[PDB]
């Protein structure tokens, strides 16, 4: 049914939204591995 | 519709696989951020 696709799609769509969120978390963490590494090196340089 | 529960379920498996890969990266990056933070603080306290 449309409801089985809608539910499976909600899982897929939400999973894509969750990929966006998971990607936002991981790209932000990578940006923050850079900020932490940069700040680590900020502190290492200091 | 009829096969979309299946296409969307497989899409969800893939979308979940990718939100998971992004989330696994978030966790790995979270561990690295934290490691960098511990090292940053190692260097900041230093």
Q: Please summarize the sheet with the most strands of chain A.
A: none
Strand content of chain A: under 5%
Distance between the termini of chain A: 63 Å
Which oligomeric state applies?
Answer: part of a larger assembly
Order of helices and strands of chain A: H
Description:
This is part of a larger assembly, with 2 copies of chain A (46 residues). Chain A is mainly α and 46 residues long. Chain A contains 1 helix and no strands. Chain A starts with a helix and ends with a helix. Chain A binds chain B through residues 1-2, 4-5, 7-9, 11-13, 15-16, 18-19, 21-23, 25-26, 29-30, 32-33, 36-37, 39-40, 43-44, 46, and chain B through 1-2, 4-9, 11-12, 14-16, 18-20, 22-23, 25-26, 29-30, 32-33, 36-37, 39-40, 43-44, 46. It is classed as contractile protein. The entry lists the keywords actin, troponin, tropomyosin, TF, contractile protein. Structure of cardiac native thin filament at pCa=5.8 having upper and lower troponins in Ca2+ bound state. Chains A, B: Tropomyosin alpha-1 chain.
